[PDB]
Amino acid sequence: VYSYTEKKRIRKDFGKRPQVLDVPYLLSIQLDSFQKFIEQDPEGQYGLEAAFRSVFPIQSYSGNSELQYVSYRLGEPVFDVQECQIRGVTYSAPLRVKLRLVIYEREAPEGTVKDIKEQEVYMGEIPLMTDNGTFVINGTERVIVSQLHRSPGVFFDSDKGKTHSSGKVLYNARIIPYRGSWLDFEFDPKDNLFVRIDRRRKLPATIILRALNYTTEQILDLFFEKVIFEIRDNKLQMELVPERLRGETASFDIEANGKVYVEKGRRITARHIRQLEKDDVKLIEVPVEYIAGKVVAKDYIDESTGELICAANMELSLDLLAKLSQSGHKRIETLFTNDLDHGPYISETLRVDPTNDRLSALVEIYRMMRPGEPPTREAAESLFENLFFSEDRYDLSAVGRMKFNRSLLREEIEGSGILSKDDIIDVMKKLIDIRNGKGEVDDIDHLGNRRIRSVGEMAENQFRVGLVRVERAVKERLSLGDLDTLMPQDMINAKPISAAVKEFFGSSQLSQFMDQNNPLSEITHKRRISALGPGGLTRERAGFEVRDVHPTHYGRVCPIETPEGPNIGLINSLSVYAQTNEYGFLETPYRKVTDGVVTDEIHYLSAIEEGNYVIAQANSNLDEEGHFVEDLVTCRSKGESSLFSRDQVDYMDVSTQQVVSVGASLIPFLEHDDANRALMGANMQRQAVPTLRADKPLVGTGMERAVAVDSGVTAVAKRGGVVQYVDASRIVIKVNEDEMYPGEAGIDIYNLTKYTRSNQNTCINQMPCVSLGEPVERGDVLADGPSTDLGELALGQNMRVAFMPWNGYNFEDSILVSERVVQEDRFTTIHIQELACVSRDTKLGPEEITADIPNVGEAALSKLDESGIVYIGAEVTGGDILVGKVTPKGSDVKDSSLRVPNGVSGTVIDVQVFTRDGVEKDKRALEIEEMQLKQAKKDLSEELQILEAGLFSRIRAVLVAGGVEAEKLDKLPRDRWLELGLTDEEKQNQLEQLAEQYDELKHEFEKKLEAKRRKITQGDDLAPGVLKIVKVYLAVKRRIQPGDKMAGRHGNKGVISKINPIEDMPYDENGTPVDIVLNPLGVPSRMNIGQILETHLGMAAKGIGDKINAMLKQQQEVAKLREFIQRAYDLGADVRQKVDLSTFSDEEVMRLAENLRKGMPIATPVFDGAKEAEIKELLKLGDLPTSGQIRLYDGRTGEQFERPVTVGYMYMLKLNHLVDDKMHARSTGSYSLVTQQPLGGKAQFGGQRFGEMEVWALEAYGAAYTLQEMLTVKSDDVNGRTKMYKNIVDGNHQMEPGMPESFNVLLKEIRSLGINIELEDE
Template identity: 70%
Template structure:
């Protein structure tokens, strides 16, 4: 017990131990001493006698977060133990006398242990990169599973349940549905871990009933002793509580307390939920189960072609987009020197640069790159050349971001009404206009790869000379046998031509003669080219060729290398150009007006140096000018040396990059060459695709209706999407209705502003209306008065498509505020409108709830799931078709389906299902031949699975034979 080599309590263990036995200090030795053991015994005896409390295993004070570093350290320690064992073994051997230390220690076990941890640990996961939100939430996930944790089967209800200590630390809403529910959680918005790994959440300090702006983080252990008020408790201007009695939390219970007793106050109403849940407007009006689905489905939204920020947001969209890292954020302030689609060059402000480095920031944008989920990552610049920027500004939008705000879907005009049964059971009906305007068109990038290996019969070759393939099939390949960029390909087209040597076959005399005449031709290689898989078509947008060291590079690989080097050279040239301009500008300022001592172009001693003279002299010769001021001469010399040093440095950097690019690639053993082809696939929205709102209101598109048949409003504008009103009451996600109303009001106000601009109303009128919109309807007060006239007009111009509103969770817009906005927009306070049937022009019987809802297209696309098979691969043993789309398999006809056919008495159908359509080998080949010959009859034989059964029974020692008459 007292030996430190046997065990170590660690800092956390000692802290928890001391706290449990009621000591004040949290430090101590890593082993137990006599006092510790006595304290433990007295605590146990007290509990037995009814004093003290028993620990709650699910309390967050008793559960800690083990971060990557700690787990990597453990893996490293395991590796070191293995090394120690190996060293001890070596030392015990006979010839251990003259061993050197480096001979004894082998670092491989340590490297292997760390590699194994990152490569195959249950917690080392492939990042979910569907959209920026899924990336952020995946990185903020905490799991109770994994090594040293629970297993799904053993975890009971208590572990999975929401605990009072989750408040502000772990989200009670965002967790997966299914077997992992409650075991995998998300961190709350403001939660962080402390030095011991316990989760903490921030609180505002309260003294004598007055809330201060000091913020303190408390862990679950510390929190229970304090009295903590809600974030939306009413405060006066001085920060004092208005009410005498305040709703508080104390010792994990909700109660009322006097305002003088309050110690802390929540920092924000959204602090109890995670990032994904905090993005749902009117979350407080949704049932928890649906909110859970809503926060999980936002992570599955596919980035659309043109991102559109939500009209009704919650105010944290910008923070999520910036923190996800998909946007380009300015590292330092300055002004934009040049912009094109793929890079932004910024000249940094003088006060933000250091003397030794060039004041240039180059941001290379990611263009049409594949994400882990095959969605498209593309960045678009937002700044223009000459713009002044500050550090932290968003320079370019990424996928699913609009002007630096998270934008996962599109704002659609929605009507809640039945329409000919097409929205039965959560089906969704959309207008053809949504398809035509590419509102939900997404780009998916597929990566296909072809590997040329060294085989026993000789190396495989990537070439355009493929046996028995016509010119039409080779039309999209270049001379190296690789598809060129921009080629539009469909299922079955060749992307990379590859031939594999065939085994020597016995040749007939005729073949021998032909061989002798024409030389060796097609027969000794077979075609193993990479083709586009079934059900896929798209455009080749990128090709990467990897060549092993020592293998000659083909023309395509060389041209790719050349273009990469040009891009590197362009970046370095631009940096150097800006640096040179900067140095020459400083020299010009320094020399202008100085007295010369001599210089190029017959510059007389004693004459004054003018701007005109400097313009006539080539810049390189400025360094030959001598002036009467020694300091200036010295500065000139320093500038010359700095310029030369920078040029040398840039040449060195270019050579370094060139080495990296032109070096051979490190490929797997036996691989000579690898080609990766990237296809961009454009997917329009179609029946069968899954869509959802942000409130767990998901559905599948049933049909796409022509614009003229859609229900339309009194002004003739047709709705975009029709949802079933029965999806709301039983699901209890009323948030979607409130979102629809607020979206309708926001759009209505935007339309009103647009009308005012078209009517060329005075700026004063515009200002008055904007003042009313922002400051009379409730919510945050904006300073519209201080804007200049030009700014008012610009603001109004930006609002014509709808006034973006933020309704934070648990602190959102009230019903009255929404009604006020509807009135301001000149719309009915009920939020309902009269609709007309697009096909007949008749009015619908009742008023319909119409408004704008934010809809997402989820990554469950019918194109990825649709699959058909005629003939294809069969299982080796049973000779039955394989299953699944990936194997080009068939549909399983299982036991219960057999019962269904038996119940119908469909005996012939059943027979062909179990024989010629499955594993009767002779029967199915004959059947295929019959169909080709146009004779439609079949003979069923013996299924192969019967033979397998007979063989398996024989393996048990029972000789069984089938006797046929």
């Protein structure tokens, strides 16, 4: 079964693997994020409720008043989106917050407040999101791009080689909070442990332990295990668990139980450890040279004399043993400092530490953090207890606590946001374990360690900044609060929240201007994952590995769609199937594989889960049950693509598109292209201009439908049904009854956006693709947008291309084009330019909008009215006048009248004017006022009458259970109608019900039309300051010409060189010329062989189209057409499509065959595409030669090209790098102010920067005079250039050079220091 615009032109779909999961809605990142930001979500997470439950209730410092929260709301926007783009306002909503002030008496923590007050106060306006994922910030339509940043939680990084210049590795460990202070631990090459906070000075790390109220003995209890020396019969024996001897040299005689176990000299092996554990060896008598290097663990004091023997962490000598042995401390605890495993890093750090107690530790930390200003007990304790341990200024989020517990192998995943003692101690323990050998480092490119911020998270963080500023303001006003004479807007202020949130949505590194020239380009700028932005890395610094593709990108980030240039691999684009995790990570779908049978259930994984499992490949042959048909299958285990068994796998890839994105999965035959040319192909495919006549890629991938629907450029039907099709203004859809609400009778009226300006000066235009009285279903398309054709996606157009050298005109990458391409207007794109004119009151009175243009004669008053301004429409070019806008006293008049820029033509399509309340002459301003005034009422009544007509009929329709008397129901016409009684049995109050409808309709229409006139009757609506505001919309129509840039989908760039006549083209023996000749020499080097298979398969597609065009032109009854269409849709191997063609009612075969006579469209999906034998077999269904190559004659000489050439249909696109936006020349005009050199650019009429390497190139020749005029006369020296212009126009090519002006600018800037630079003797 198919929908009704699916039976229009059903694309022949190759593809063997049955898809199990359909493509998700391609704009779901932006929409789900911003729907999380604004939503009334009780339990607080996440959203605006999290912000209000963090900041509220505010209580002042015992001020006995506590403003609390109830509920918030967003009212209607005062401007809908279209008039918002026209006017220039933000597309925002007012944020109505209920606030409840309660005020206490004296001594009321528990006492009832003395008075309350509560109001729906107004703070800020937040910009809402348009239904397509965009904002409208100041008239322009902008997009917030999702950031990719390091997750909160601990990271163990190495930096193995570069420091110390000695090959010794370090190991640092960064505890990155979501909000607050950064804490880093790091080794130094003396093997000492150092802490630093916020990249400040370096403190030896155990001082932070001494800041957490840990004595030295507790620290040594933590990071070291005790070795027990017992004072015994002789020589102070040792408890020895045999694990501690692993891998060391036996220094002494190892004997016990009257038996010599291990002698001196040999290293202790694990067999000797087994001997000591089997022989149960713990207590052995040591020599005195064994204890002479060890370190004591805890303190010991001489008991009788009452003083100290040794401090904790002290190495031992023999006389120290003579001190402690004679006192009476029988147990001696020593620190086991294994040189292999258990290193003495904490102990040597304690030897570096200049502190001894907690208080000096806090004083040293306070002198680190805030220097100069003294370190007192209260100040240092408040500093360190609010560094990490308070809920205000340090907060690992839920993501941070999950990563923090996961990297430390904790059991739980939810905990408190602040740190604790045990967390810092665990980070130090894991860092020490990594130094010892056990456990390993983390990498930063691993996408399980890399979170995504999106629109709702970033706007929520900015909103929380605004709320903490307004709570500091509320704490300010409340302690100065006098009661009861204030209500909660003398306390609260709508200014900082609105200021912060407009600061983010206006001027941020991620709220950026939408690339809008294409449905692809909109939908792939909204799905963008940037590494840049605040808190992330920069373009000009880093690096090599963060610009590189890591094995966790499989199915999360597109490997091949990243922009070439200064930021490669920072501006990654998101994959097709990849959602976003609850915590913000990238989870991608996989198919759960319990046993041999691959189950059709899906299950989402992130990269910290994808490593543990074994995940199959998308294309591994499985037949009729899910069993892998091989006994071994390529999978990947832990980022390593390897071959595993038939029955080990736990997951399989869902579909074979899922590695790449929606820009580079529209490229058919992707798997045959090179990676570089697929990158250049996707990046150019974003840049296509919408042509005037949209044309359906013959070789597509089938993802055109989802991109053209999901990007909101087409008018997808909301509720299904039929159609009324007024359409000149709007599509009117009557709704079928099942999808139709009981009240609100209701028919859907779709607004078509006709010719208007895009963000890239292209033309966004919608055209209805459904006729009158034609069924449509829910989700079906109704109006084709820019670059769409019946709901598909038509960026460029499909043309007949020959691969051959043709007389040098396609030399390096150039492209030689027939005249049949430029006669048919099949690339003639439409550009629209907005031009503003304002008459601001700079000085010496205000400027004026009058045609009475001066000095200039009967060449001003022409394309305008008698009162000034361009008169609309017209064939305006360059140097014309659009808006007469000149002042007197500025015989002292001038010409600021905004004219048409140099080189452009066009037609004035629209003139907008919300000017300084006065623009009118004696009456046009109020003349049109009456026109709109009468317009509103007309439609207002019309619509009511339209429904009235439908209701009147409905009244009679229902008039059967309560008066069906046809001759007794046609009484009053426009007066009343139904007048019958009923009583009970069946409910027929319908008449009464519909009576209310009409009654309310007229009653509401009056009010509806009452406000209409009110709105109509007005000067105009805009902001203040600016006075004369005249915007004129030209529309140039640019065709194609030698110098434009065209390109296919594979990376084959080209500058169209010669626009040949039709005759000189290479025609085949049938007679048709070829349209575009490309060059075969690009194909062996640039290894993008996919354009040839697109060429052959498009040739086969148009072969079927020519065959259907013959069978339908030379008209046959529909049996032969349905037989040939059925053969065309069966065609070859096992596919997914076949068709159910004998259910197309003998007319939907014919409408399909009317829409196929330009070529049968073929879906070649991304990595499961059409094989070559099917291309040959399809070329045999059409009557074309199997090789794909036709013999071609030459249009010049009439004689055959030897060795037959390739002709086919490639889908070639026109990129928006047009040659009459690049052509520029300058002889003489205006310059800058500071310098005497020419200005730069094209919009400024400026000259070429003759840069540094061109000066070196002229020095490389003997061009001393060319360089002398190149930097003195042509550029800078003012006397030289005026003398040169007069010398040229006299006929004397001679320069009088002088000295450059910018060098005298250099002399004054150097001399304006204390520097006396001069110019010496003659």
